Design a protein around this ligand. Structure first.
Ligand SMILES: CC[C@H]1OC(=O)[C@H](C)[C@@H](O[C@H]2C[C@@](C)(OC)[C@@H](O)[C@H](C)O2)[C@H](C)[C@@H](O[C@@H]2O[C@H](C)C[C@H](N(C)C)[C@H]2O)[C@](C)(O)C[C@@H](C)C(=O)[C@H](C)[C@@H](O)[C@]1(C)O
Ligand SMILES: CC[C@H]1OC(=O)[C@H](C)[C@@H](O[C@H]2C[C@@](C)(OC)[C@@H](O)[C@H](C)O2)[C@H](C)[C@@H](O[C@@H]2O[C@H](C)C[C@H](N(C)C)[C@H]2O)[C@](C)(O)C[C@@H](C)C(=O)[C@H](C)[C@@H](O)[C@]1(C)O
Ligand SMILES: [Cl-]
Ligand SMILES: [Cl-]
Lengths: 184, 185
């Protein structure tokens, strides 16, 4: 496997499967089909590879959110938030995200990228707000996604998206009380 | 004389908040409470059993704390309760340890049940304080705002935790209770 991008994607697979503590160059090397020495020549060491991977994360969030088609009014916002929430993968071990997030906060380089990642998502929501959205509505919507996601991770009932989006629908009704119900 | 079980578990919880659940050891708790490692083994068997007892005490403390918050009336009484609840989270030391504690709980079924009980106690505590005319499932939305806004702050801190979270709580309460005044801290 050749490109920096192909290698960083394979390393991301490993990070999701093992978490950041058990993450190793050897495990990336075995995933991507390259020698560990090759990873070292291209990315210097474990810590530096983690940084490049998380840089690619923030890039991919921005790349992803920026091209999602924009619909009109509260209904467009609702559509966007559905796509956003459904984008989260719960198929293997969702709890690894909380270990990832914790680990990121301990390493200044990763912490800055984590901030950029959340800022990108908040700004992505902000740009989909129709006129008449309450002030700072983007912060509230991102909080509901993160908080309801946590609720479900601890105490799961049904699919993540259904738990989160029910709450999103509820807050959208409060933000746009003259709109028709938001269909989930 | 013997130190109480509550004193020992308190000391252990301080250690857990300092080192996190991966680095938590009997030796650390012993150093913290002035007791021998041997004495801790006698009373609490092992490190895993000690963590279960600490987390059982945690759920008890949550329930006791929520019961102790004065009960007001109306949307104002709910806002007052929420202010106390949010301000109850200690930010004296490294708040990010809470995310590790949460992750670890999810890995250990006995601890995960207790984390579920904790969140359920807080959700139910909010629910019992909802005035009539709060929207359906408002207690879940309010808990989500606290959790989500706290995580936003823990990743990207601007000022005090409570200030960041309560600005959003005030915002949603305005939406829930449009016929009410602005909610002031
Ligand atoms: C702690 C709990 C927090 O989770 C995380 O921070 C983990 C650690 C991220 O993965 C981190 C780390 C990592 C390696 O994925 C595990 C990386 O690939 C991503 C970009 O960021 C997640 C899952 C990201 O998902 C990514 O959302 C993109 C829009 C699409 C992408 N996917 C379709 C490709 C998906 O994975 C993303 C950006 O945070 C989702 C948005 C909705 C949020 O802001 C939500 C509210 C999160 O703050 C959160 C759930 O509260
Ligand atoms: C991950 C992020 C989550 O944090 C935790 O789960 C950590 C791990 C708990 O500590 C865990 C673990 C531990 C050891 O503390 C770190 C234990 O002592 C407490 C009870 O539970 C926190 C902090 C608890 O604080 C406690 O709130 C009580 C009302 C009063 C109590 N204390 C001041 C009287 C205070 O500690 C408590 C209950 O979760 C606060 C309520 C508001 C929540 O439900 C919020 C929304 C959380 O779910 C959260 C912030 O999203
Ligand atoms: Cl994902
Ligand atoms: Cl606390």
């Amino acid at each position: 496997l050749k490109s920096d991008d192909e290698v960083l994607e394979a390393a991301t697979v490993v990070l999701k499967r093992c978490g950041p503590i058990e993450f190793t160059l050897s495990g990336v090397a075995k995933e991507v089909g390259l020698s560990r020495a090759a990873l070292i020549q291209r990315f210097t060491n474990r810590d530096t590879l983690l940084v490049r991977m998380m840089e690619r994360g923030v890039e991919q969030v921005r790349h992803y959110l920026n091209a999602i088609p924009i619909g009109a009014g509260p209904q467009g916002l609702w559509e966007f938030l559905q796509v956003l929430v459904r984008s989260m993968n719960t198929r293997n071990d969702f709890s690894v995200n909380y270990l990832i997030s914790w680990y990121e906060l301990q390493v200044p380089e990763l912490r800055t990228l984590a901030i950029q990642r959340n800022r990108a998502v908040v700004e992505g929501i902000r740009k989909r707000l129709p006129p008449g959205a309450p002030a700072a509505a983007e912060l509230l919507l991102h909080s509901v996604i993160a908080g309801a996601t946590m609720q479900w991770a601890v105490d799961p009932d049904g699919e993540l998206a259904d738990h989160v989006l029910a709450q999103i629908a509820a807050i959208l009704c409060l933000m746009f009380p003259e709109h028709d119900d938001f269909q989930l």
